[PDB]
Coordinates of C-alpha atoms and ligand atoms in Angstrom, one line a residue:
Chain A
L4 CA 125.7 158.3 25.3
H5 CA 128.7 157.3 27.4
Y6 CA 132.4 158.2 26.7
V7 CA 134.7 155.9 28.7
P8 CA 138.5 155.5 29.0
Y9 CA 140.4 152.7 27.5
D10 CA 141.0 151.0 30.9
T11 CA 137.2 150.7 31.7
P12 CA 136.4 147.3 33.1
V13 CA 134.9 145.0 30.5
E14 CA 131.8 144.4 32.7
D15 CA 131.1 148.1 32.8
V16 CA 131.2 148.4 29.0
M17 CA 128.9 145.4 28.6
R18 CA 126.6 147.0 31.3
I19 CA 126.4 150.3 29.3
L20 CA 125.9 148.4 26.1
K21 CA 123.0 146.6 27.7
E22 CA 121.4 149.8 29.1
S23 CA 122.1 152.4 26.4
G24 CA 123.0 150.2 23.4
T25 CA 126.1 152.1 22.4
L26 CA 129.2 153.9 23.8
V27 CA 132.5 155.4 22.8
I28 CA 135.9 154.0 24.0
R29 CA 138.2 156.9 23.9
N30 CA 141.8 156.1 22.8
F31 CA 140.5 152.7 21.4
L32 CA 143.5 152.9 19.1
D33 CA 146.5 155.1 19.0
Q34 CA 146.5 157.7 16.2
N35 CA 149.6 155.9 14.9
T36 CA 147.7 152.8 14.0
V37 CA 144.6 154.4 12.3
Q38 CA 146.9 156.6 10.2
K39 CA 148.9 153.6 9.2
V40 CA 145.8 151.9 7.9
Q41 CA 144.9 154.9 5.8
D42 CA 148.5 155.1 4.5
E43 CA 148.5 151.4 3.5
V44 CA 145.2 151.8 1.7
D45 CA 146.6 154.7 -0.3
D46 CA 149.6 152.7 -1.2
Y47 CA 147.3 149.9 -2.5
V48 CA 144.9 151.9 -4.6
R49 CA 147.6 154.1 -6.0
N50 CA 145.1 156.7 -7.3
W51 CA 146.7 159.2 -9.7
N52 CA 147.0 162.7 -8.1
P53 CA 148.1 165.3 -10.7
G54 CA 151.0 167.7 -9.9
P55 CA 150.6 171.4 -10.3
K56 CA 151.9 171.4 -13.9
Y57 CA 151.9 169.0 -16.8
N58 CA 155.0 166.7 -16.9
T68 CA 146.0 152.0 -9.8
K69 CA 143.7 149.3 -8.3
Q70 CA 140.1 149.5 -7.1
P71 CA 139.8 149.2 -3.3
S72 CA 139.4 145.7 -2.0
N73 CA 139.1 144.2 1.5
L74 CA 140.8 146.2 4.2
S75 CA 142.5 143.0 5.4
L76 CA 144.0 142.8 1.9
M77 CA 145.0 146.4 1.4
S78 CA 146.3 147.0 4.9
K79 CA 148.9 144.9 6.8
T80 CA 148.2 146.9 9.9
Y81 CA 144.5 146.1 9.7
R82 CA 144.9 142.4 9.4
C83 CA 147.8 142.1 11.9
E84 CA 146.9 144.6 14.7
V85 CA 143.4 146.0 14.3
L86 CA 141.7 142.6 13.9
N87 CA 143.6 141.4 17.0
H88 CA 142.2 144.3 19.1
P89 CA 141.5 142.8 22.6
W90 CA 138.6 145.2 23.1
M91 CA 136.9 143.9 19.9
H92 CA 137.2 140.2 21.0
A93 CA 136.3 140.8 24.7
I94 CA 133.0 142.4 23.6
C95 CA 132.4 139.9 20.8
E96 CA 133.1 136.9 23.1
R97 CA 130.6 138.1 25.7
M98 CA 128.1 139.1 23.1
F99 CA 128.0 136.0 20.8
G100 CA 129.8 133.4 22.8
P101 CA 127.1 132.2 25.2
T102 CA 124.5 132.0 22.4
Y103 CA 126.5 131.1 19.3
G104 CA 129.9 129.9 20.4
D105 CA 132.3 131.2 17.7
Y106 CA 132.1 134.5 15.9
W107 CA 133.9 135.8 12.9
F108 CA 134.5 138.9 10.8
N109 CA 131.5 140.2 8.9
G110 CA 132.8 143.2 6.9
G111 CA 135.0 146.2 7.2
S112 CA 134.5 149.5 5.3
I113 CA 136.3 152.8 4.8
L114 CA 134.0 155.5 6.1
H115 CA 135.1 158.6 4.3
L116 CA 132.5 161.4 4.2
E117 CA 133.0 163.7 1.2
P118 CA 132.4 167.5 1.7
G119 CA 128.9 168.4 0.9
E120 CA 127.4 164.9 1.4
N121 CA 123.9 165.0 2.8
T122 CA 122.7 163.3 5.9
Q123 CA 122.6 159.5 5.9
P124 CA 119.2 157.7 6.4
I125 CA 118.8 156.6 10.0
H126 CA 119.1 152.8 10.2
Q127 CA 120.0 149.7 12.1
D128 CA 122.9 147.7 10.7
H129 CA 121.2 144.3 11.0
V130 CA 118.4 145.4 8.6
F131 CA 119.7 143.2 5.8
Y132 CA 119.4 140.1 7.9
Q133 CA 116.1 138.4 7.0
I134 CA 116.2 136.9 10.6
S135 CA 116.1 140.3 12.3
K136 CA 112.3 139.8 12.1
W137 CA 112.5 136.6 14.2
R138 CA 114.7 138.2 16.8
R139 CA 113.4 140.1 19.9
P140 CA 115.2 143.1 21.5
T141 CA 116.3 141.0 24.5
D142 CA 118.0 138.4 22.3
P143 CA 121.7 138.9 21.5
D144 CA 122.5 141.1 18.5
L145 CA 123.1 139.8 15.0
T146 CA 126.2 141.8 14.3
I147 CA 128.4 144.5 15.9
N148 CA 130.3 147.4 14.3
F149 CA 133.4 149.1 15.7
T150 CA 133.7 152.6 14.0
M151 CA 137.2 154.1 14.5
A152 CA 137.9 157.7 13.9
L153 CA 140.8 158.9 11.7
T154 CA 139.9 162.5 11.5
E155 CA 138.0 164.2 14.3
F156 CA 134.3 163.3 14.4
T157 CA 132.4 166.6 14.9
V158 CA 128.9 167.8 14.4
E159 CA 129.9 169.8 11.3
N160 CA 132.0 167.2 9.5
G161 CA 129.1 164.6 9.7
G162 CA 130.1 162.5 12.7
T163 CA 127.9 159.5 13.5
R164 CA 124.7 160.2 15.4
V165 CA 123.3 157.6 17.8
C166 CA 119.9 157.4 19.6
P167 CA 120.6 155.7 23.0
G168 CA 118.1 153.1 24.3
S169 CA 116.7 152.6 20.8
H170 CA 118.3 149.1 20.7
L171 CA 115.5 147.9 23.1
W172 CA 112.7 149.2 20.8
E173 CA 110.4 146.5 19.5
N174 CA 110.6 145.3 15.9
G175 CA 108.9 147.6 13.4
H176 CA 109.2 150.6 15.8
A177 CA 109.5 153.8 13.6
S178 CA 112.9 155.3 13.0
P179 CA 113.9 157.8 15.7
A180 CA 113.4 161.5 15.2
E181 CA 116.3 163.6 13.9
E182 CA 115.9 166.0 16.9
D183 CA 116.5 163.0 19.3
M184 CA 119.7 161.9 17.5
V185 CA 122.8 162.4 19.7
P186 CA 126.0 163.3 17.7
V187 CA 129.2 161.3 18.6
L188 CA 132.2 163.6 19.1
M189 CA 135.4 161.7 18.7
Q190 CA 139.1 162.3 18.5
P191 CA 141.5 160.3 16.3
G192 CA 141.7 156.8 17.8
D193 CA 138.4 156.8 19.6
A194 CA 135.8 154.2 18.6
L195 CA 132.0 154.2 18.5
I196 CA 130.6 150.8 19.5
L197 CA 127.6 150.0 17.3
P198 CA 125.5 146.9 17.9
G199 CA 123.3 145.9 14.9
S200 CA 120.2 147.0 16.7
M201 CA 121.3 150.6 17.5
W202 CA 119.6 153.2 15.3
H203 CA 122.2 155.5 13.8
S204 CA 123.3 157.4 10.8
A205 CA 126.1 159.6 9.6
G206 CA 125.4 163.3 9.5
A207 CA 125.9 165.8 6.7
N208 CA 129.5 167.0 6.1
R209 CA 129.2 170.8 5.9
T210 CA 133.0 171.4 6.2
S211 CA 135.7 171.6 3.5
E212 CA 137.5 168.5 4.5
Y213 CA 136.8 164.7 4.5
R214 CA 135.5 163.0 7.6
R215 CA 137.8 159.9 7.7
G216 CA 137.7 156.6 9.5
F217 CA 137.0 152.9 9.1
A218 CA 135.2 150.1 10.7
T219 CA 135.4 146.4 11.7
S220 CA 132.3 144.3 12.2
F221 CA 131.8 140.8 13.6
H222 CA 128.8 138.4 13.8
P223 CA 128.0 134.8 14.8
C224 CA 129.9 132.0 13.1
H225 CA 126.7 130.5 11.7
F226 CA 125.9 133.6 9.6
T227 CA 127.6 134.2 6.2
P228 CA 129.9 137.3 6.3
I229 CA 129.5 140.2 4.0
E230 CA 133.0 139.8 2.8
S231 CA 134.9 136.7 1.7
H232 CA 138.7 136.6 2.0
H233 CA 139.3 133.5 -0.1
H234 CA 141.1 135.6 -2.8
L235 CA 143.8 136.8 -0.4
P236 CA 147.3 135.5 -1.2
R237 CA 148.6 132.6 0.9
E238 CA 151.5 134.7 2.2
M239 CA 149.1 137.1 3.9
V240 CA 147.0 134.3 5.5
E241 CA 150.1 132.7 7.0
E242 CA 151.2 135.9 8.7
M243 CA 147.8 136.2 10.4
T244 CA 147.4 135.1 13.9
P245 CA 145.3 131.9 14.4
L246 CA 142.5 134.1 15.8
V247 CA 142.5 136.3 12.7
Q248 CA 142.7 133.3 10.4
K249 CA 139.4 132.2 12.1
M250 CA 138.0 135.7 11.9
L251 CA 138.6 135.9 8.1
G252 CA 137.2 132.4 7.2
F253 CA 140.3 130.1 7.1
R254 CA 139.4 127.9 10.0
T255 CA 136.6 125.6 11.1
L256 CA 134.1 127.2 13.5
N257 CA 132.6 125.7 16.7
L258 CA 129.0 126.4 17.5
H259 CA 127.5 126.7 21.0
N260 CA 126.6 123.0 21.1
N261 CA 130.1 122.0 19.9
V262 CA 128.8 121.1 16.4
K263 CA 131.3 122.3 13.8
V264 CA 130.6 124.3 10.7
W265 CA 132.9 125.5 7.9
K266 CA 134.7 122.1 8.0
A267 CA 136.9 120.4 5.4
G268 CA 135.0 117.1 5.0
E269 CA 134.9 115.7 8.5
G270 CA 138.1 117.5 9.6
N271 CA 139.2 121.1 10.1
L272 CA 139.6 123.4 7.1
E273 CA 143.0 124.6 8.5
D274 CA 144.2 121.0 8.4
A275 CA 143.2 120.3 4.8
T276 CA 144.7 123.6 3.5
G277 CA 148.0 123.1 5.4
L278 CA 147.6 126.3 7.3
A283 CA 155.7 125.9 12.9
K284 CA 154.3 126.2 16.4
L285 CA 156.6 123.6 18.0
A286 CA 159.5 124.7 15.9
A287 CA 159.4 128.2 17.4
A288 CA 158.9 126.9 21.0
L289 CA 161.4 124.0 20.9
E290 CA 165.0 124.9 20.2
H291 CA 165.8 121.3 19.2
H292 CA 163.2 121.2 16.5
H293 CA 165.1 120.8 13.2
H294 CA 163.0 123.7 11.7
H295 CA 163.6 126.1 14.6
Chain B
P2 CA 99.3 114.2 6.0
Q3 CA 101.0 111.0 4.8
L4 CA 104.1 109.7 3.0
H5 CA 103.8 110.0 -0.8
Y6 CA 105.7 108.1 -3.5
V7 CA 105.7 110.2 -6.7
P8 CA 107.3 109.7 -10.1
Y9 CA 110.0 111.9 -11.6
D10 CA 107.7 113.8 -14.0
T11 CA 105.5 115.1 -11.1
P12 CA 104.8 118.8 -11.5
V13 CA 106.8 121.0 -9.1
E14 CA 103.8 122.7 -7.4
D15 CA 102.5 119.3 -6.5
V16 CA 105.9 118.5 -4.8
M17 CA 105.8 121.8 -3.0
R18 CA 102.2 121.2 -2.0
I19 CA 103.1 117.8 -0.6
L20 CA 106.1 119.3 1.2
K21 CA 103.9 122.0 2.8
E22 CA 101.2 119.5 3.7
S23 CA 103.2 116.5 4.7
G24 CA 106.8 117.8 5.3
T25 CA 108.4 115.0 3.2
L26 CA 108.0 112.8 0.2
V27 CA 109.9 110.4 -2.1
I28 CA 110.7 111.2 -5.7
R29 CA 111.2 107.9 -7.5
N30 CA 114.0 107.4 -10.1
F31 CA 115.6 110.6 -8.9
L32 CA 118.9 109.2 -10.3
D33 CA 119.4 106.6 -12.9
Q34 CA 121.3 103.4 -12.3
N35 CA 124.4 104.8 -14.1
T36 CA 124.8 107.7 -11.6
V37 CA 124.1 105.3 -8.7
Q38 CA 126.9 103.0 -9.9
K39 CA 129.3 105.8 -10.9
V40 CA 129.2 107.7 -7.5
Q41 CA 129.8 104.4 -5.7
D42 CA 132.8 103.6 -7.8
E43 CA 134.4 107.1 -7.5
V44 CA 134.1 107.1 -3.7
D45 CA 135.7 103.7 -3.4
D46 CA 138.8 104.8 -5.4
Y47 CA 139.4 107.8 -3.2
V48 CA 139.1 105.6 0.0
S72 CA 131.6 113.6 3.6
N73 CA 133.8 115.7 1.3
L74 CA 131.8 114.2 -1.5
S75 CA 132.5 117.0 -4.1
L76 CA 136.2 116.3 -3.7
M77 CA 135.9 112.5 -3.9
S78 CA 133.4 112.0 -6.7
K79 CA 133.6 113.8 -10.0
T80 CA 130.0 112.7 -10.7
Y81 CA 128.9 114.3 -7.5
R82 CA 130.3 117.7 -8.2
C83 CA 129.7 117.8 -12.0
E84 CA 126.3 116.1 -12.3
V85 CA 124.6 115.5 -9.0
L86 CA 125.0 119.0 -7.7
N87 CA 123.4 120.2 -10.9
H88 CA 120.3 118.1 -10.3
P89 CA 117.2 120.0 -11.7
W90 CA 114.9 118.8 -8.9
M91 CA 117.2 120.0 -6.2
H92 CA 117.4 123.5 -7.6
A93 CA 113.7 123.7 -8.5
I94 CA 112.7 122.8 -4.9
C95 CA 115.5 125.0 -3.3
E96 CA 114.4 128.0 -5.5
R97 CA 110.8 127.8 -4.3
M98 CA 111.8 127.1 -0.6
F99 CA 114.6 129.7 -0.1
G100 CA 114.2 132.1 -3.0
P101 CA 111.3 134.3 -1.8
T102 CA 112.8 134.9 1.7
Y103 CA 116.6 134.7 1.2
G104 CA 117.2 134.9 -2.5
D105 CA 120.3 132.7 -3.1
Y106 CA 121.0 129.4 -1.5
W107 CA 124.1 127.2 -1.4
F108 CA 125.4 123.7 -0.4
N109 CA 125.2 122.9 3.3
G110 CA 126.6 119.4 3.6
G111 CA 126.6 115.9 2.1
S112 CA 127.7 112.5 3.4
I113 CA 127.7 108.8 2.6
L114 CA 124.9 107.2 4.7
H115 CA 126.3 103.8 5.3
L116 CA 124.4 101.4 7.7
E117 CA 126.3 98.3 8.7
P118 CA 124.5 95.1 9.7
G119 CA 123.5 95.1 13.4
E120 CA 123.5 98.9 13.8
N121 CA 120.7 100.0 16.1
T122 CA 118.0 102.6 15.5
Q123 CA 119.2 106.2 15.2
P124 CA 117.7 108.8 17.6
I125 CA 114.7 110.6 16.0
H126 CA 115.6 114.2 15.3
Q127 CA 115.1 117.2 13.2
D128 CA 118.0 118.1 10.9
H129 CA 117.9 121.9 11.7
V130 CA 118.3 121.1 15.4
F131 CA 121.8 122.4 15.5
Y132 CA 120.8 125.9 14.2
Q133 CA 120.6 128.2 17.3
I134 CA 118.0 130.2 15.3
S135 CA 115.7 127.2 15.1
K136 CA 114.5 128.5 18.5
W137 CA 113.3 131.7 16.9
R138 CA 111.6 130.1 13.9
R139 CA 107.9 129.4 13.5
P140 CA 106.8 126.2 11.8
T141 CA 105.1 128.4 9.1
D142 CA 108.4 130.1 8.3
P143 CA 110.6 128.6 5.5
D144 CA 112.9 125.8 6.5
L145 CA 116.5 126.4 7.6
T146 CA 117.9 123.6 5.4
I147 CA 116.7 120.7 3.2
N148 CA 118.3 117.3 2.6
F149 CA 118.1 115.0 -0.4
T150 CA 118.7 111.4 0.7
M151 CA 119.4 109.2 -2.3
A152 CA 119.4 105.4 -2.1
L153 CA 122.4 103.5 -3.4
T154 CA 121.2 100.1 -2.1
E155 CA 117.5 99.3 -1.5
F156 CA 115.9 101.0 1.5
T157 CA 113.8 98.4 3.3
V158 CA 112.2 98.6 6.8
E159 CA 114.4 95.7 7.9
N160 CA 117.7 97.0 6.6
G161 CA 117.3 100.3 8.4
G162 CA 115.5 102.4 5.8
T163 CA 114.8 106.0 6.9
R164 CA 111.6 106.6 8.8
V165 CA 109.7 109.9 8.8
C166 CA 106.7 111.3 10.7
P167 CA 104.5 113.1 8.1
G168 CA 103.1 116.4 9.5
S169 CA 105.6 116.6 12.4
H170 CA 107.3 119.5 10.6
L171 CA 104.3 121.7 11.6
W172 CA 104.7 121.0 15.3
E173 CA 105.8 124.0 17.4
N174 CA 109.4 124.2 18.5
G175 CA 110.2 122.3 21.7
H176 CA 107.5 119.8 20.9
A177 CA 108.5 116.4 22.2
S178 CA 109.9 113.9 19.7
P179 CA 107.6 111.5 17.9
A180 CA 107.0 108.1 19.5
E181 CA 108.8 105.2 17.8
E182 CA 105.4 103.9 16.7
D183 CA 104.4 107.0 14.8
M184 CA 107.4 106.7 12.4
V185 CA 106.7 105.6 8.8
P186 CA 109.5 103.6 7.1
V187 CA 110.6 104.8 3.7
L188 CA 111.0 102.2 0.9
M189 CA 113.3 103.1 -2.0
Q190 CA 114.9 101.4 -4.9
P191 CA 118.4 102.4 -5.9
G192 CA 118.1 105.9 -7.4
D193 CA 115.0 107.0 -5.4
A194 CA 115.4 110.1 -3.2
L195 CA 113.8 111.1 0.1
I196 CA 113.2 114.8 0.5
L197 CA 113.9 115.9 4.1
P198 CA 113.2 119.5 5.1
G199 CA 115.1 120.6 8.3
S200 CA 111.9 120.5 10.3
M201 CA 110.9 116.9 9.5
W202 CA 111.4 114.5 12.4
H203 CA 113.1 111.4 11.1
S204 CA 115.7 108.7 11.9
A205 CA 117.5 105.7 10.4
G206 CA 116.2 102.4 11.5
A207 CA 118.0 99.3 12.7
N208 CA 119.8 97.3 10.1
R209 CA 118.6 93.8 11.0
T210 CA 119.7 92.3 7.7
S211 CA 123.0 90.8 6.7
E212 CA 124.0 93.5 4.1
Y213 CA 124.9 97.2 4.5
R214 CA 122.3 99.8 3.8
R215 CA 123.9 102.5 1.6
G216 CA 122.8 106.0 0.6
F217 CA 124.2 109.5 0.2
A218 CA 122.9 113.0 0.6
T219 CA 123.0 116.5 -0.6
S220 CA 121.7 119.4 1.5
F221 CA 121.2 123.1 0.8
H222 CA 120.3 126.1 3.0
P223 CA 119.9 129.9 2.7
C224 CA 123.0 131.9 1.5
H225 CA 123.1 133.9 4.7
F226 CA 123.9 130.8 6.8
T227 CA 127.3 129.3 7.1
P228 CA 127.6 125.8 5.6
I229 CA 128.6 122.7 7.6
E230 CA 131.3 122.0 4.9
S231 CA 133.7 124.4 3.3
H232 CA 135.2 123.6 -0.1
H233 CA 138.0 126.2 -0.1
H234 CA 140.5 123.3 0.2
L235 CA 139.5 121.9 -3.2
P236 CA 142.0 122.2 -6.0
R237 CA 141.6 125.0 -8.5
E238 CA 141.4 122.7 -11.5
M239 CA 138.6 120.9 -9.8
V240 CA 136.7 124.2 -9.2
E241 CA 137.0 125.0 -12.9
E242 CA 135.3 121.8 -13.9
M243 CA 132.2 123.0 -12.1
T244 CA 129.3 124.8 -13.6
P245 CA 128.8 128.4 -12.5
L246 CA 125.8 127.2 -10.5
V247 CA 127.8 124.5 -8.7
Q248 CA 130.6 127.0 -8.1
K249 CA 128.1 129.2 -6.3
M250 CA 126.7 126.1 -4.4
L251 CA 130.2 125.3 -3.1
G252 CA 131.2 128.8 -1.9
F253 CA 133.2 130.2 -4.8
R254 CA 130.9 133.0 -5.9
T255 CA 129.3 136.0 -4.3
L256 CA 125.7 135.5 -3.1
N257 CA 122.7 137.8 -3.7
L258 CA 120.2 138.3 -0.9
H259 CA 116.4 138.7 -1.3
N260 CA 116.8 142.4 -1.0
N261 CA 119.6 142.8 -3.7
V262 CA 122.2 143.0 -0.9
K263 CA 125.4 140.9 -1.5
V264 CA 127.3 138.7 0.9
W265 CA 130.4 136.7 0.4
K266 CA 132.0 139.5 -1.6
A267 CA 135.6 140.3 -2.4
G268 CA 136.1 143.9 -1.3
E269 CA 133.3 145.6 -3.1
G270 CA 133.3 143.3 -6.2
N271 CA 132.3 139.7 -6.7
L272 CA 134.5 136.9 -5.3
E273 CA 134.6 135.1 -8.7
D274 CA 136.0 138.2 -10.4
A275 CA 138.7 138.6 -7.8
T276 CA 139.8 135.0 -8.1
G277 CA 139.6 135.0 -11.9
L278 CA 137.3 132.0 -11.8
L285 CA 129.7 133.4 -21.7
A286 CA 132.7 131.2 -22.4
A287 CA 130.5 128.2 -23.0
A288 CA 127.9 130.1 -25.0
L289 CA 130.1 132.1 -27.3
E290 CA 132.7 130.0 -29.2
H291 CA 135.0 133.0 -29.9
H292 CA 135.6 133.4 -26.2
Ligands
FE2_301 FE1 125.5 151.9 9.7
FE2_302 FE1 119.0 113.4 9.6

């Protein structure tokens, strides 16, 4: 397991991902940003917390509940640098798969050790040298420690052949992370969260991306149009509002024979040209 | 293996047996003449994107019991849910030359990983609007070529078997079946149109999120799932295409037909 600074060259990170199958990018995000995501999620769910004396929505997509998530986190250059080099040559485009809140409650037992691509039926056609089917970025809000259940990884196990037994608990390496660090988790890396034996939640959240030709865990078609229009064009494509280009330049997710973003009406020249009557 | 012409009332397991053995077949009178006429008229008034252009396509054709019976047995065991992939008008003008012989699943990067004994990546239903004759460019198939290993060379032009269809007949084209349109050496256009379906875990060629809400509410729940408006269930009870943790159709506010007090 490698812990690398934010300014590590991209080729070195992909090199380590190839060799060991995982790594941690310290200071992946500033503590400011990860805390803002948690704050915006709290403001969305609005769970009732009783005062000391007598005197709400269910959680949805992180891109819906958190403006910071859909405007800053999903534009993270480290996410797209790794995703472009991981899926690009084989699949062309990639897009957002799913993003979860990873809050470990005090007293929760150890998580089963698993690969994230296990629910892909086609993980049985893939060989360990092929590109991964998905990649997770797990960002710490609280500290990730041994006691509070920080994620454990088994380096090298991404090259294990298909059907290889799950790794042994003794050979699971805990990931120790400060707020803002991120654990890089390809879909083939064997991992699991540990037991939280402390009196406080282990907090954090994740993004994940996978090839454009695979159906994402989450749809974002229920999001209001005002949120979709404040997204960058890159994030609009990530969240399923734009046509995708395969490796062979065949298009999927099209609106008829044209692009989806054209049929839905999803400003550029007006901002650039001062003489545009909409500037 | 050979090309088979079977009637509408053929039992399903025979159709699947023929599909496994020969990789293709024709179901006669797949549509009646009314549907053949109605879809032609609706497209003309609008003039792919067939669900948007033809009310008969999205309300009746996409509910076709043969499509769902075949798709259930082809994709159900391995992937669970399936949904709409793409669909286009197949219009052949006089003088058009022969189409390159191809497999439809060729554009899936994961066709390289698949074995011929695995389930198909996609299936096409090519329905004739005009007659399909050998001289007007009727589709040609190569029965048994779906079982060739990947990277196998294309069939020779002489190994291709033309398909003959009256208006309303349908050719069933798994993604592994080598096929091509012929040259239209007649004086009248050869017309058809297609539906296609593929596993729920694969991204469709065509999105339908640009369709109007009132249009989507005309659809059946089944067709709503076909066209990307409902959460999909995998073979292993895992869900994809979900809204947060709930179903997409609940989050959009998409029983009511069964109970009159609803
Ligand atoms: Fe996981
Ligand atoms: Fe074709």
